[PDB]
Amino acid sequence: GPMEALIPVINKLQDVFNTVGADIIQLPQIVVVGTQSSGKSSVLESLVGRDLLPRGTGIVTRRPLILQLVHVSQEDKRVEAEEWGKFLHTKNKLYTDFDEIRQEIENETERISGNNKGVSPEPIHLKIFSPNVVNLTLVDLPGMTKVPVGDQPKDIELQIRELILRFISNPNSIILAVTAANTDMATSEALKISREVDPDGRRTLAVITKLDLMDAGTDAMDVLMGRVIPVKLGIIGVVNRSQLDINNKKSVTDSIRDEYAFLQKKYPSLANRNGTKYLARTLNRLLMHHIRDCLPELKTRINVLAAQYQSLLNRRKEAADMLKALQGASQIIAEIRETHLW
Amino acid sequence: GPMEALIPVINKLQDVFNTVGADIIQLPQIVVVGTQSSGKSSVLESLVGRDLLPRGTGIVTRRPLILQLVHVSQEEEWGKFLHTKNKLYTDFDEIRQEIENETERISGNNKGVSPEPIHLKIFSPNVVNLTLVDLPGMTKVPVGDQPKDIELQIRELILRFISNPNSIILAVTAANTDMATSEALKISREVDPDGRRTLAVITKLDLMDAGTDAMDVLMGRVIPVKLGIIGVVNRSQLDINNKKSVTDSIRDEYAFLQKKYPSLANRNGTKYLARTLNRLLMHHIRDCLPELKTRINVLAAQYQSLLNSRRKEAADMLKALQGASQIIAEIRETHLW
Ligand SMILES: Nc1nc2c(ncn2[C@@H]2O[C@H](COP(=O)(O)OP(N)(=O)O)[C@@H](O)[C@H]2O)c(=O)[nH]1
Ligand SMILES: Nc1nc2c(ncn2[C@@H]2O[C@H](COP(=O)(O)OP(N)(=O)O)[C@@H](O)[C@H]2O)c(=O)[nH]1
Ligand SMILES: [Ca+2]
Ligand SMILES: [Mg+2]
Ligand SMILES: [Mg+2]
């Protein structure tokens, strides 16, 4: 997938965490928000690079999906041969086929939310284990709506908006504020709600989907150049698979190639600052910023243990081994701080 | 234009009001509502069949436009703005440009929105007495000059118009958005909860993602709308830039519906929207008739008892009352296309 760049950094972090006995730095959760059917689940899944999320026409995401990417060491290892999933609700059952994972999200949605468009705030908890992912939580959410349909109650719009607010009010989260290109940016429910929890725009990244669907005679040039609504962290256009493409089993590889071709053709001056890879790179930078901000905490925590193991040295092999391990940890911190992603 | 069918009906209704010496009822205002850029102004002007409304991307309609169609008696077409008083406009591109100018004068040149209406009269032999109201579309995030509470200002401006019980609401939703996300239908249901005066229009059918269509929406399988859900295809921004005519737009709309919605094509498109609206307007007309009827009876006995074995005027104005009752019956019996 497009978010492998941080793997060597988080491997070094894991070395430190193993010594310190605590996973002290937690990456922000990445939470996708926007109007129903704006292309949200497609964006989130593009960060995985594997097809595992129900996507489609009408209301689709009907429970929060807390999707925990879990990096797997070479020791705990087993391409479809190396990756697997576990759901909390299916206890210890292992999933190898990502199509079956997708179906189970749908299964578990139907069980709690019903089969006539109902929505539930109860999250589905999913872990995806892989040697090729970082430790990162992605959150898929129901999209904002206006008029109740199916089983939905009269106050469904507010139920959904309050549910979104609970996830993005988390200070340690990054909001992917999704708006479809075939709507006016000023009508963006994603940017409105993001500004309520993040008024200064320190953790909101604007994603513009469906660039391919814009009316003839129009384009998103002004939008993508920040000439409509400025958004500090970035405004990034993407092109994901159409419903036709989904129906035709179009691959992720072909989706990305066509997105590249599309941007080269219609937005040549802006192409290198747009697309799915650029969204990933932008996100990596935000995640690395969080890591760097937290290094002093980590360093201090090493010193706490270093002084403590040095003390009962003043269980003796235990102490000498740990001090060396903690000296190793201290060197690692400096290496991480000084890492810059290509 | 697409809405001439009521001309003969309002003409004979006028005769009845003339005869009874009463003021003719006003037809309800037709008010277009929806999210910014959903296709509202294109829908509203399609009921006129002349290009007089500014249309485009970004925020365009930034003042209400109260477009009063005025039927011209024998005893072509032109416009009059209240603010210019006397000047008459025969050039409809010049009318359009004046709407833009007036909008900039009061709302400024940086995306600001004003509740002050533009009053425009369009005089024609080929129109009925009818008021069409164009409104700024709903929004979420302030841009340019707009204050923090712009969304609420626009929404309450809309409510000011559609809260009028003598209004028909054209609830406009773009086909390239999920119907359940319709801000037009949400707001319409607030002022018209039983759907007695809300007509749903689905624009931009041609812009739907490949592998999708509005079949479920148009058959009432998503949100039911009592009075109807009617799909239309108006001119793209490319078509506007290229000055594509109304005639060509309608032809291509018809063709698109035949090709993509053959089973529903007869109950969709701009012509069907106009016919559906005429039928709604006819409903209002029939509801004024009992009032008119009782007034004819009062004047009838008032003229009849006035007798002496002047003495021929009361004789022929009794016959003009008899004529008026039969015209009322005719209106009730009239079928519309
Ligand atoms: N043409 C096009 N279609 C898209 C794009 N992104 C999503 N879609 C389509 O839009 C629909 C909604 O996609 P989804 O990811 O489920 O969005 P949601 N409902 O906001 O979770 C799907 O039919 C999908 O194929 C895009 O960039 N271009
Ligand atoms: N392709 C297509 N474009 C449309 C349609 N209706 C409106 N548009 C385009 O959408 C934009 C907004 O149209 P307009 O009538 O001004 O809508 P508004 N802003 O809601 O008053 C314009 O660029 C117009 O060309 C449609 O049915 N199909
Ligand atoms: Ca080392
Ligand atoms: Mg979704
Ligand atoms: Mg308009």
PDB file of N, CA, C and O in Angstrom, chain A residues 35-37 57-59 144-149 157 182-184 186-189 191-192 195 213 215-218 228-229 242-244 247, chain B residues 35-37 57-59 138-143 151 176-178 180-183 185-186 189 207 209-212 222-223 236-238 241:
ATOM      1  N   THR A  35     -20.448  13.965   3.890  1.00  0.00           N
ATOM      2  CA  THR A  35     -21.797  13.605   3.480  1.00  0.00           C
ATOM      3  C   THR A  35     -21.851  12.139   3.042  1.00  0.00           C
ATOM      4  O   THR A  35     -20.860  11.591   2.564  1.00  0.00           O
ATOM      5  N   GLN A  36     -22.991  11.495   3.267  1.00  0.00           N
ATOM      6  CA  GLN A  36     -23.257  10.158   2.740  1.00  0.00           C
ATOM      7  C   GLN A  36     -22.927  10.100   1.249  1.00  0.00           C
ATOM      8  O   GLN A  36     -23.285  11.010   0.486  1.00  0.00           O
ATOM      9  N   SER A  37     -22.239   9.026   0.866  1.00  0.00           N
ATOM     10  CA  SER A  37     -21.853   8.711  -0.522  1.00  0.00           C
ATOM     11  C   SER A  37     -20.879   9.679  -1.195  1.00  0.00           C
ATOM     12  O   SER A  37     -20.853   9.783  -2.419  1.00  0.00           O
ATOM     13  N   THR A  57     -23.503   2.310  -3.861  1.00  0.00           N
ATOM     14  CA  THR A  57     -24.552   3.320  -3.944  1.00  0.00           C
ATOM     15  C   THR A  57     -25.436   3.280  -2.693  1.00  0.00           C
ATOM     16  O   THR A  57     -25.554   2.233  -2.043  1.00  0.00           O
ATOM     17  N   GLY A  58     -26.042   4.425  -2.373  1.00  0.00           N
ATOM     18  CA  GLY A  58     -26.952   4.568  -1.232  1.00  0.00           C
ATOM     19  C   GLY A  58     -26.208   4.580   0.088  1.00  0.00           C
ATOM     20  O   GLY A  58     -25.002   4.810   0.122  1.00  0.00           O
ATOM     21  N   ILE A  59     -26.919   4.331   1.182  1.00  0.00           N
ATOM     22  CA  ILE A  59     -26.278   4.272   2.491  1.00  0.00           C
ATOM     23  C   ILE A  59     -25.561   2.928   2.638  1.00  0.00           C
ATOM     24  O   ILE A  59     -26.149   1.865   2.397  1.00  0.00           O
ATOM     25  N   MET A 144     -23.116  11.923   6.751  1.00  0.00           N
ATOM     26  CA  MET A 144     -24.201  12.822   7.119  1.00  0.00           C
ATOM     27  C   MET A 144     -25.339  12.774   6.098  1.00  0.00           C
ATOM     28  O   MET A 144     -25.111  12.567   4.900  1.00  0.00           O
ATOM     29  N   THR A 145     -26.561  12.936   6.600  1.00  0.00           N
ATOM     30  CA  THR A 145     -27.765  12.773   5.805  1.00  0.00           C
ATOM     31  C   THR A 145     -28.791  13.850   6.181  1.00  0.00           C
ATOM     32  O   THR A 145     -28.540  14.658   7.084  1.00  0.00           O
ATOM     33  N   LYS A 146     -29.935  13.878   5.491  1.00  0.00           N
ATOM     34  CA  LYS A 146     -30.930  14.938   5.732  1.00  0.00           C
ATOM     35  C   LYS A 146     -32.355  14.452   5.929  1.00  0.00           C
ATOM     36  O   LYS A 146     -33.114  15.058   6.691  1.00  0.00           O
ATOM     37  N   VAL A 147     -32.724  13.392   5.215  1.00  0.00           N
ATOM     38  CA  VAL A 147     -34.089  12.880   5.232  1.00  0.00           C
ATOM     39  C   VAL A 147     -34.070  11.387   5.570  1.00  0.00           C
ATOM     40  O   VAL A 147     -33.433  10.598   4.869  1.00  0.00           O
ATOM     41  N   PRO A 148     -34.762  10.996   6.659  1.00  0.00           N
ATOM     42  CA  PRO A 148     -34.785   9.599   7.091  1.00  0.00           C
ATOM     43  C   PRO A 148     -35.330   8.683   6.005  1.00  0.00           C
ATOM     44  O   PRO A 148     -36.272   9.055   5.300  1.00  0.00           O
ATOM     45  N   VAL A 149     -34.726   7.504   5.873  1.00  0.00           N
ATOM     46  CA  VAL A 149     -35.178   6.465   4.938  1.00  0.00           C
ATOM     47  C   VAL A 149     -35.167   5.108   5.649  1.00  0.00           C
ATOM     48  O   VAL A 149     -34.486   4.935   6.653  1.00  0.00           O
ATOM     49  N   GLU A 157     -30.375  12.370  11.315  1.00  0.00           N
ATOM     50  CA  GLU A 157     -29.291  13.274  10.932  1.00  0.00           C
ATOM     51  C   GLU A 157     -28.448  13.635  12.164  1.00  0.00           C
ATOM     52  O   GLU A 157     -27.218  13.533  12.137  1.00  0.00           O
ATOM     53  N   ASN A 182     -18.002  17.067  -7.487  1.00  0.00           N
ATOM     54  CA  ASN A 182     -19.213  17.428  -8.225  1.00  0.00           C
ATOM     55  C   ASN A 182     -20.246  18.155  -7.328  1.00  0.00           C
ATOM     56  O   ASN A 182     -21.425  18.273  -7.673  1.00  0.00           O
ATOM     57  N   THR A 183     -19.776  18.643  -6.183  1.00  0.00           N
ATOM     58  CA  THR A 183     -20.542  19.549  -5.329  1.00  0.00           C
ATOM     59  C   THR A 183     -19.684  20.793  -5.083  1.00  0.00           C
ATOM     60  O   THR A 183     -18.453  20.736  -5.214  1.00  0.00           O
ATOM     61  N   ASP A 184     -20.317  21.921  -4.752  1.00  0.00           N
ATOM     62  CA  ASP A 184     -19.558  23.138  -4.444  1.00  0.00           C
ATOM     63  C   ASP A 184     -18.858  22.970  -3.102  1.00  0.00           C
ATOM     64  O   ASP A 184     -19.473  22.489  -2.151  1.00  0.00           O
ATOM     65  N   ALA A 186     -18.096  25.076  -0.877  1.00  0.00           N
ATOM     66  CA  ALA A 186     -18.760  25.820   0.203  1.00  0.00           C
ATOM     67  C   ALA A 186     -19.931  25.047   0.836  1.00  0.00           C
ATOM     68  O   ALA A 186     -20.389  25.398   1.929  1.00  0.00           O
ATOM     69  N   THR A 187     -20.397  23.985   0.168  1.00  0.00           N
ATOM     70  CA  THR A 187     -21.453  23.123   0.721  1.00  0.00           C
ATOM     71  C   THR A 187     -20.880  21.934   1.512  1.00  0.00           C
ATOM     72  O   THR A 187     -21.609  21.011   1.850  1.00  0.00           O
ATOM     73  N   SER A 188     -19.580  21.963   1.805  1.00  0.00           N
ATOM     74  CA  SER A 188     -18.897  20.822   2.415  1.00  0.00           C
ATOM     75  C   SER A 188     -19.307  20.630   3.874  1.00  0.00           C
ATOM     76  O   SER A 188     -18.898  21.386   4.745  1.00  0.00           O
ATOM     77  N   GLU A 189     -20.102  19.599   4.128  1.00  0.00           N
ATOM     78  CA  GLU A 189     -20.446  19.239   5.496  1.00  0.00           C
ATOM     79  C   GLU A 189     -19.234  18.736   6.285  1.00  0.00           C
ATOM     80  O   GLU A 189     -19.166  18.925   7.507  1.00  0.00           O
ATOM     81  N   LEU A 191     -16.089  19.896   5.968  1.00  0.00           N
ATOM     82  CA  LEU A 191     -15.298  21.031   6.473  1.00  0.00           C
ATOM     83  C   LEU A 191     -16.004  21.823   7.576  1.00  0.00           C
ATOM     84  O   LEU A 191     -15.360  22.298   8.510  1.00  0.00           O
ATOM     85  N   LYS A 192     -17.328  21.921   7.485  1.00  0.00           N
ATOM     86  CA  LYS A 192     -18.129  22.539   8.554  1.00  0.00           C
ATOM     87  C   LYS A 192     -17.957  21.810   9.893  1.00  0.00           C
ATOM     88  O   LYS A 192     -17.654  22.432  10.918  1.00  0.00           O
ATOM     89  N   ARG A 195     -14.345  22.032  11.362  1.00  0.00           N
ATOM     90  CA  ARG A 195     -14.074  23.335  11.974  1.00  0.00           C
ATOM     91  C   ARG A 195     -14.682  23.488  13.357  1.00  0.00           C
ATOM     92  O   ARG A 195     -14.210  24.303  14.149  1.00  0.00           O
ATOM     93  N   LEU A 213     -15.904  13.195 -12.098  1.00  0.00           N
ATOM     94  CA  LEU A 213     -17.360  13.330 -12.272  1.00  0.00           C
ATOM     95  C   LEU A 213     -17.849  14.770 -12.483  1.00  0.00           C
ATOM     96  O   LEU A 213     -19.056  15.024 -12.615  1.00  0.00           O
ATOM     97  N   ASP A 215     -18.909  18.223 -14.042  1.00  0.00           N
ATOM     98  CA  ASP A 215     -19.581  18.665 -15.254  1.00  0.00           C
ATOM     99  C   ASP A 215     -18.597  19.195 -16.312  1.00  0.00           C
ATOM    100  O   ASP A 215     -17.613  19.885 -15.985  1.00  0.00           O
ATOM    101  N   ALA A 216     -18.850  18.861 -17.573  1.00  0.00           N
ATOM    102  CA  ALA A 216     -18.071  19.454 -18.672  1.00  0.00           C
ATOM    103  C   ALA A 216     -18.120  20.984 -18.582  1.00  0.00           C
ATOM    104  O   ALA A 216     -19.180  21.583 -18.317  1.00  0.00           O
ATOM    105  N   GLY A 217     -16.970  21.608 -18.810  1.00  0.00           N
ATOM    106  CA  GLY A 217     -16.842  23.057 -18.687  1.00  0.00           C
ATOM    107  C   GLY A 217     -16.427  23.514 -17.300  1.00  0.00           C
ATOM    108  O   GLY A 217     -16.301  24.706 -17.049  1.00  0.00           O
ATOM    109  N   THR A 218     -16.230  22.572 -16.378  1.00  0.00           N
ATOM    110  CA  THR A 218     -15.818  22.945 -15.027  1.00  0.00           C
ATOM    111  C   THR A 218     -14.629  22.102 -14.619  1.00  0.00           C
ATOM    112  O   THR A 218     -14.381  21.026 -15.188  1.00  0.00           O
ATOM    113  N   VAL A 228     -10.808  28.745  -2.981  1.00  0.00           N
ATOM    114  CA  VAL A 228     -12.200  28.758  -2.553  1.00  0.00           C
ATOM    115  C   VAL A 228     -12.224  28.814  -1.032  1.00  0.00           C
ATOM    116  O   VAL A 228     -12.469  29.866  -0.459  1.00  0.00           O
ATOM    117  N   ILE A 229     -11.981  27.681  -0.386  1.00  0.00           N
ATOM    118  CA  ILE A 229     -11.774  27.655   1.051  1.00  0.00           C
ATOM    119  C   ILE A 229     -10.316  27.266   1.272  1.00  0.00           C
ATOM    120  O   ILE A 229      -9.871  26.236   0.764  1.00  0.00           O
ATOM    121  N   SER A 242     -15.135   4.019  -9.975  1.00  0.00           N
ATOM    122  CA  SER A 242     -16.560   4.208 -10.177  1.00  0.00           C
ATOM    123  C   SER A 242     -17.308   2.927  -9.818  1.00  0.00           C
ATOM    124  O   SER A 242     -16.687   1.868  -9.603  1.00  0.00           O
ATOM    125  N   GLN A 243     -18.636   3.030  -9.738  1.00  0.00           N
ATOM    126  CA  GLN A 243     -19.468   1.874  -9.448  1.00  0.00           C
ATOM    127  C   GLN A 243     -19.329   0.856 -10.577  1.00  0.00           C
ATOM    128  O   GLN A 243     -19.236  -0.347 -10.315  1.00  0.00           O
ATOM    129  N   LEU A 244     -19.327   1.346 -11.818  1.00  0.00           N
ATOM    130  CA  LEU A 244     -19.007   0.507 -12.980  1.00  0.00           C
ATOM    131  C   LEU A 244     -17.680  -0.255 -12.778  1.00  0.00           C
ATOM    132  O   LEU A 244     -17.635  -1.484 -12.979  1.00  0.00           O
ATOM    133  N   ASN A 247     -18.078  -2.934 -10.196  1.00  0.00           N
ATOM    134  CA  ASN A 247     -18.828  -4.009 -10.843  1.00  0.00           C
ATOM    135  C   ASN A 247     -17.953  -4.832 -11.790  1.00  0.00           C
ATOM    136  O   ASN A 247     -18.143  -6.045 -11.917  1.00  0.00           O
TER     137      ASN A 247
ATOM    138  N   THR B  35     -29.790  23.055  -2.271  1.00  0.00           N
ATOM    139  CA  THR B  35     -28.397  23.330  -1.975  1.00  0.00           C
ATOM    140  C   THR B  35     -27.821  24.200  -3.086  1.00  0.00           C
ATOM    141  O   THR B  35     -28.256  24.109  -4.245  1.00  0.00           O
ATOM    142  N   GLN B  36     -26.858  25.042  -2.729  1.00  0.00           N
ATOM    143  CA  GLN B  36     -26.095  25.804  -3.709  1.00  0.00           C
ATOM    144  C   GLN B  36     -25.605  24.909  -4.856  1.00  0.00           C
ATOM    145  O   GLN B  36     -25.049  23.834  -4.620  1.00  0.00           O
ATOM    146  N   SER B  37     -25.848  25.370  -6.083  1.00  0.00           N
ATOM    147  CA  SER B  37     -25.399  24.738  -7.322  1.00  0.00           C
ATOM    148  C   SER B  37     -26.075  23.430  -7.704  1.00  0.00           C
ATOM    149  O   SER B  37     -25.549  22.687  -8.530  1.00  0.00           O
ATOM    150  N   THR B  57     -21.330  28.005 -12.055  1.00  0.00           N
ATOM    151  CA  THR B  57     -20.693  27.406 -10.876  1.00  0.00           C
ATOM    152  C   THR B  57     -20.338  28.446  -9.822  1.00  0.00           C
ATOM    153  O   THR B  57     -20.341  29.654 -10.097  1.00  0.00           O
ATOM    154  N   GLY B  58     -20.021  27.971  -8.619  1.00  0.00           N
ATOM    155  CA  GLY B  58     -19.795  28.853  -7.475  1.00  0.00           C
ATOM    156  C   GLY B  58     -21.127  29.459  -7.083  1.00  0.00           C
ATOM    157  O   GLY B  58     -22.179  29.034  -7.571  1.00  0.00           O
ATOM    158  N   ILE B  59     -21.102  30.441  -6.195  1.00  0.00           N
ATOM    159  CA  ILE B  59     -22.347  31.068  -5.760  1.00  0.00           C
ATOM    160  C   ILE B  59     -22.768  32.069  -6.831  1.00  0.00           C
ATOM    161  O   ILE B  59     -21.964  32.901  -7.267  1.00  0.00           O
ATOM    162  N   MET B 138     -28.687  26.661  -0.290  1.00  0.00           N
ATOM    163  CA  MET B 138     -28.133  26.396   1.030  1.00  0.00           C
ATOM    164  C   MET B 138     -26.654  26.051   0.982  1.00  0.00           C
ATOM    165  O   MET B 138     -26.151  25.470   0.002  1.00  0.00           O
ATOM    166  N   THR B 139     -25.952  26.441   2.039  1.00  0.00           N
ATOM    167  CA  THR B 139     -24.515  26.271   2.090  1.00  0.00           C
ATOM    168  C   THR B 139     -24.065  25.843   3.489  1.00  0.00           C
ATOM    169  O   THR B 139     -24.899  25.726   4.387  1.00  0.00           O
ATOM    170  N   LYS B 140     -22.760  25.589   3.659  1.00  0.00           N
ATOM    171  CA  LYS B 140     -22.215  25.072   4.919  1.00  0.00           C
ATOM    172  C   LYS B 140     -21.036  25.873   5.464  1.00  0.00           C
ATOM    173  O   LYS B 140     -20.889  26.019   6.678  1.00  0.00           O
ATOM    174  N   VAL B 141     -20.185  26.376   4.574  1.00  0.00           N
ATOM    175  CA  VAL B 141     -18.959  27.067   4.993  1.00  0.00           C
ATOM    176  C   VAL B 141     -18.909  28.457   4.362  1.00  0.00           C
ATOM    177  O   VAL B 141     -19.004  28.576   3.143  1.00  0.00           O
ATOM    178  N   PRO B 142     -18.791  29.515   5.194  1.00  0.00           N
ATOM    179  CA  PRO B 142     -18.736  30.902   4.694  1.00  0.00           C
ATOM    180  C   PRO B 142     -17.555  31.130   3.749  1.00  0.00           C
ATOM    181  O   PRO B 142     -16.455  30.658   4.025  1.00  0.00           O
ATOM    182  N   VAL B 143     -17.782  31.829   2.638  1.00  0.00           N
ATOM    183  CA  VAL B 143     -16.697  32.205   1.728  1.00  0.00           C
ATOM    184  C   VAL B 143     -16.729  33.704   1.442  1.00  0.00           C
ATOM    185  O   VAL B 143     -17.770  34.344   1.584  1.00  0.00           O
ATOM    186  N   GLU B 151     -25.102  30.412   6.666  1.00  0.00           N
ATOM    187  CA  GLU B 151     -25.988  29.267   6.429  1.00  0.00           C
ATOM    188  C   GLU B 151     -27.397  29.531   6.955  1.00  0.00           C
ATOM    189  O   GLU B 151     -28.394  29.329   6.235  1.00  0.00           O
ATOM    190  N   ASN B 176     -26.564  13.492  -8.883  1.00  0.00           N
ATOM    191  CA  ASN B 176     -25.242  12.998  -8.550  1.00  0.00           C
ATOM    192  C   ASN B 176     -24.961  13.128  -7.036  1.00  0.00           C
ATOM    193  O   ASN B 176     -23.811  13.083  -6.590  1.00  0.00           O
ATOM    194  N   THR B 177     -26.031  13.305  -6.266  1.00  0.00           N
ATOM    195  CA  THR B 177     -25.965  13.206  -4.804  1.00  0.00           C
ATOM    196  C   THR B 177     -27.009  12.180  -4.354  1.00  0.00           C
ATOM    197  O   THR B 177     -27.993  11.936  -5.066  1.00  0.00           O
ATOM    198  N   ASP B 178     -26.799  11.566  -3.194  1.00  0.00           N
ATOM    199  CA  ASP B 178     -27.788  10.637  -2.654  1.00  0.00           C
ATOM    200  C   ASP B 178     -29.077  11.379  -2.293  1.00  0.00           C
ATOM    201  O   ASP B 178     -29.040  12.406  -1.609  1.00  0.00           O
ATOM    202  N   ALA B 180     -31.339  10.838  -0.099  1.00  0.00           N
ATOM    203  CA  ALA B 180     -31.482  11.023   1.350  1.00  0.00           C
ATOM    204  C   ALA B 180     -30.750  12.255   1.886  1.00  0.00           C
ATOM    205  O   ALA B 180     -31.095  12.748   2.971  1.00  0.00           O
ATOM    206  N   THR B 181     -29.751  12.752   1.143  1.00  0.00           N
ATOM    207  CA  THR B 181     -29.019  13.964   1.546  1.00  0.00           C
ATOM    208  C   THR B 181     -29.692  15.261   1.061  1.00  0.00           C
ATOM    209  O   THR B 181     -29.126  16.340   1.201  1.00  0.00           O
ATOM    210  N   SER B 182     -30.894  15.160   0.491  1.00  0.00           N
ATOM    211  CA  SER B 182     -31.581  16.338  -0.037  1.00  0.00           C
ATOM    212  C   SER B 182     -31.942  17.397   1.012  1.00  0.00           C
ATOM    213  O   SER B 182     -32.888  17.229   1.792  1.00  0.00           O
ATOM    214  N   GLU B 183     -31.225  18.510   0.978  1.00  0.00           N
ATOM    215  CA  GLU B 183     -31.573  19.643   1.813  1.00  0.00           C
ATOM    216  C   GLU B 183     -32.909  20.264   1.405  1.00  0.00           C
ATOM    217  O   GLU B 183     -33.623  20.780   2.255  1.00  0.00           O
ATOM    218  N   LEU B 185     -35.636  18.668   0.207  1.00  0.00           N
ATOM    219  CA  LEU B 185     -36.734  17.882   0.766  1.00  0.00           C
ATOM    220  C   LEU B 185     -36.810  18.023   2.290  1.00  0.00           C
ATOM    221  O   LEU B 185     -37.904  18.181   2.838  1.00  0.00           O
ATOM    222  N   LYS B 186     -35.661  18.033   2.971  1.00  0.00           N
ATOM    223  CA  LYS B 186     -35.661  18.306   4.427  1.00  0.00           C
ATOM    224  C   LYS B 186     -36.391  19.604   4.776  1.00  0.00           C
ATOM    225  O   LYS B 186     -37.301  19.599   5.621  1.00  0.00           O
ATOM    226  N   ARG B 189     -40.220  19.599   4.002  1.00  0.00           N
ATOM    227  CA  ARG B 189     -40.974  18.815   4.969  1.00  0.00           C
ATOM    228  C   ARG B 189     -41.204  19.565   6.275  1.00  0.00           C
ATOM    229  O   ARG B 189     -42.160  19.279   6.980  1.00  0.00           O
ATOM    230  N   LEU B 207     -25.145  13.441 -15.173  1.00  0.00           N
ATOM    231  CA  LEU B 207     -23.858  13.492 -14.448  1.00  0.00           C
ATOM    232  C   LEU B 207     -23.654  12.343 -13.454  1.00  0.00           C
ATOM    233  O   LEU B 207     -22.658  12.303 -12.721  1.00  0.00           O
ATOM    234  N   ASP B 209     -22.630   8.918 -11.896  1.00  0.00           N
ATOM    235  CA  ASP B 209     -21.553   7.940 -12.040  1.00  0.00           C
ATOM    236  C   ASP B 209     -21.963   6.736 -12.908  1.00  0.00           C
ATOM    237  O   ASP B 209     -23.062   6.193 -12.750  1.00  0.00           O
ATOM    238  N   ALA B 210     -21.065   6.318 -13.800  1.00  0.00           N
ATOM    239  CA  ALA B 210     -21.254   5.110 -14.607  1.00  0.00           C
ATOM    240  C   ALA B 210     -21.529   3.910 -13.702  1.00  0.00           C
ATOM    241  O   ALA B 210     -20.884   3.749 -12.669  1.00  0.00           O
ATOM    242  N   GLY B 211     -22.502   3.092 -14.096  1.00  0.00           N
ATOM    243  CA  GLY B 211     -22.935   1.946 -13.297  1.00  0.00           C
ATOM    244  C   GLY B 211     -23.983   2.284 -12.245  1.00  0.00           C
ATOM    245  O   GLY B 211     -24.329   1.438 -11.411  1.00  0.00           O
ATOM    246  N   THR B 212     -24.465   3.527 -12.262  1.00  0.00           N
ATOM    247  CA  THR B 212     -25.550   3.961 -11.390  1.00  0.00           C
ATOM    248  C   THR B 212     -26.634   4.655 -12.218  1.00  0.00           C
ATOM    249  O   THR B 212     -26.379   5.110 -13.342  1.00  0.00           O
ATOM    250  N   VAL B 222     -36.979   5.538  -2.875  1.00  0.00           N
ATOM    251  CA  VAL B 222     -36.029   6.054  -1.886  1.00  0.00           C
ATOM    252  C   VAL B 222     -36.750   6.955  -0.878  1.00  0.00           C
ATOM    253  O   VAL B 222     -36.961   6.552   0.263  1.00  0.00           O
ATOM    254  N   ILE B 223     -37.128   8.160  -1.303  1.00  0.00           N
ATOM    255  CA  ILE B 223     -38.015   9.016  -0.526  1.00  0.00           C
ATOM    256  C   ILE B 223     -39.303   9.166  -1.329  1.00  0.00           C
ATOM    257  O   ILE B 223     -39.262   9.593  -2.482  1.00  0.00           O
ATOM    258  N   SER B 236     -25.262  21.805 -19.383  1.00  0.00           N
ATOM    259  CA  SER B 236     -23.982  21.780 -18.699  1.00  0.00           C
ATOM    260  C   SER B 236     -23.322  23.156 -18.740  1.00  0.00           C
ATOM    261  O   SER B 236     -23.772  24.065 -19.477  1.00  0.00           O
ATOM    262  N   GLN B 237     -22.259  23.325 -17.962  1.00  0.00           N
ATOM    263  CA  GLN B 237     -21.514  24.592 -18.013  1.00  0.00           C
ATOM    264  C   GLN B 237     -20.891  24.807 -19.395  1.00  0.00           C
ATOM    265  O   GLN B 237     -20.867  25.931 -19.906  1.00  0.00           O
ATOM    266  N   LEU B 238     -20.379  23.726 -19.980  1.00  0.00           N
ATOM    267  CA  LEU B 238     -19.905  23.750 -21.367  1.00  0.00           C
ATOM    268  C   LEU B 238     -20.997  24.284 -22.316  1.00  0.00           C
ATOM    269  O   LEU B 238     -20.711  25.134 -23.163  1.00  0.00           O
ATOM    270  N   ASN B 241     -21.510  27.991 -21.797  1.00  0.00           N
ATOM    271  CA  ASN B 241     -20.384  28.706 -22.393  1.00  0.00           C
ATOM    272  C   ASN B 241     -20.516  28.747 -23.913  1.00  0.00           C
ATOM    273  O   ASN B 241     -20.112  29.720 -24.539  1.00  0.00           O
TER     274      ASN B 241
END
